[PDB]
Amino acid sequence: QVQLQQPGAELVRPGASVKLSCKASGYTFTSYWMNWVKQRPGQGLECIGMIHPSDGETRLNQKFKDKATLTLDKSSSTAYMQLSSPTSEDSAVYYCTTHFDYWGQGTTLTVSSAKTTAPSVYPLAPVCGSSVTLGCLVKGYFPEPVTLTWNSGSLSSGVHTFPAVLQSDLYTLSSSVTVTSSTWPSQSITCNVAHPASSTKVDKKIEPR
Amino acid sequence: DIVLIQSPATLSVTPGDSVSLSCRASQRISNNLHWYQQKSHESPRLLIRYTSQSISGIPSRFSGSGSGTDFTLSINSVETEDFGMYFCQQSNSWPFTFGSGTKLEMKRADAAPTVSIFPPSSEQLTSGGASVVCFLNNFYPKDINVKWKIDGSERQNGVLNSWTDQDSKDSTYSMSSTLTLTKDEYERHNSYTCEATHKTSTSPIVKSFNRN
Amino acid sequence: KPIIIGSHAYGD
């Protein structure tokens, strides 16, 4: 079947050009248009433009005339979109799609000058009912993502792990776990945080105050 | 350049109920109007093309209609797999443009947040900062206000909020609120309060602690 | 040839 393959994530510094790739398989690459679509976090979809691999015919949304450049590697069935002088306004998901039916999975582009920074991990015990909730606060890391678990993934029910948000140029996220009162502190509960981009793993055991 | 308006931005419906969504174009677009579904973390998926043409594999409960300027997507008997974002897109004039989207969320019984407040980690204070955390878990509907008070006075600066997507098993929402202060500011006050105002009561839900 | 929405998966 048709596949359109895009890398999940790209990080660019402001001003540095980035070139996103869309590799097409399963059909004749010169037989259909290729579209690019921008989607900002909570927002809508904007067509950037399209290029036809047969003859290189291209139609560009004039909003992007000085931002995007569409090209092709016909020999590898790959379509490209180059974003020039990226700014925080270009941070977005970018989808390729042929005729808006087959879609790539989208590339999350982040434009940032932040440096790779390991997270600080803080255990959140209760102040000092039938159940008790504990928390784990992950502050000041870059890039995304971190992976947070409780007791190495053993403790998975009653968990809320919240989307990461920007605290500055750095990310922060948190997680609550809820367990019956009789289970903690008699049983150990630990927050585990992995940040592969900094090759860091952090365990914080939750201790009564 | 052609503007498509999807109003309202959110709809709440119970599984089994029927729904229609609205899309209105700033100018006439003939039948060049298509509908897309987009679930959380997924690319969009074409549902109906050219106003009313069905898409192979899409359930027959989806249908489209419209006339040049006003369009509707109908879903008879919404099912749990239908909840998500819906967009319309015109292809009458380049640039092709999308509406802003209508989110279909699952209606359920109102539920007040379960609220938990946490003093800063004492290890964090050695960094010179102090984060007070409030979790507001498993409430419904999504709309909620959180107010932080320090020794009884409202505090605006330094709060960071983050919200979970609607829960795929019990249809609730949850929220985290972090108030970050300097160590010195944290230590020179003694009462910390997280106040949650929600449709579920005209009285705020309050959790607070005293630093010692 | 003009793009037709959905014609790649679903024909002209």
The CATH number for A83's domain is: 2.60.40.10
Q: Are residues A87 and A129 in the same domain?
A: no
DSSP letter for A42, please. Answer: T
List the determination method.
X-ray
List C-alpha distances in Å: A69 to A21, A124, B95, B194: 12, 48, 16, 49
Domains of chain B from N-terminus onward: 1-108 (2.60.40.10), 109-212 (2.60.40.10)
> Distance between CA A73 and CA A194 in Å, rounded?
37
Q: Are A56 and A125 in contact (CB under 8 A)?
A: no
Give the structural domain span for A133: 114-209
Q: ω into residue A53 within 30 of 0, thus cis?
A: no
Q: Is residue A62 classed as helix, strand or coil in its secondary structure?
A: helix
Please report residues of B whose CB lies closer than 8 A to that of C6: 34, 46, 49, 53, 55
Which chain A residues are closer than 8 Å to B162 by Cβ?
162-165, 173-174
Looking at the structure, tell me whether residues A9 and A104 fall in a common domain: yes
Same domain, A86 and A121: no
Alpha helices in B67-110 (DSSP H): none
Of the CA atoms within 13 Å of residue B127, those in its CB half-sphere come to 16
Q: What is the resolution in angstroms?
A: 1.9
Contact A27 C5 (CB under 8 A): no
For residues A74 and A53, the answer to whether their CB atoms sit within 8 Å is yes
Pair (A148, A164) in one structural domain:
yes
* Residue A140 and residue A84 in one domain: no
CA closest to A28 among chain C residues: C8
Q: Among A98, A113, A128, which residue terminates a domain?
A: A113
Are both A9 and A107 inside the same structural domain?
yes
Helix and strand counts by DSSP (H, E) for chain B: 2, 19
φ, ψ for residue A74 (rounded to 5)? -60, -35
> Chain C contacts of A101, Cβ < 8 Å?
5-10
Contact A97 B43 (CB under 8 A): yes
**Domains in chain A, number:** 2
First to last CA, chain B: 60
Place of tokens 């009884």: B152
- Closest residue in C to B55 (Cα) is C10
Instruction: Clarify whether residues A67 and A19 are in a common domain.
Output: yes
Both tokens assigned to A47: 């067509």
What is the DSSP secondary structure assignment for residue C7, as one 8-state letter?
Answer: H
Q: Assign C9 to helix, strand or coil.
A: helix
Range 1-12 of C in CB contact (< 8 A) with B: 3, 5-6, 9-10
A/C interface, count of CB pairs below 8 Å: 26
Q: Are residues A103 and A126 in the same domain?
A: no
Q: CA separation (Å) from A192 to A168, B112, B154, B165? A: 23, 30, 34, 23
Interface contact flag, C5 A99, Cβ < 8 Å: yes
Q: Determine if the peptide bond prior to B141 is cis (ω within 30°).
A: yes
φ/ψ region of A81 (left if φ > 0, alpha if ψ in -120 to 50, else beta) reads beta
Q: Are residues A96 and A20 in the same domain?
A: yes
My answer on whether A19 and A94 are in the same domain is yes
A108 and A148, same domain (yes or no): no
Q: Exposure of A208 by Cβ count < 10 A (0-12 exposed, 13-18 middle, 19+ buried)?
A: exposed
Indicate whether A91 and A145 sit together in one domain.
no
Smallest CA–CA distance from B173 into chain A, residue: A160
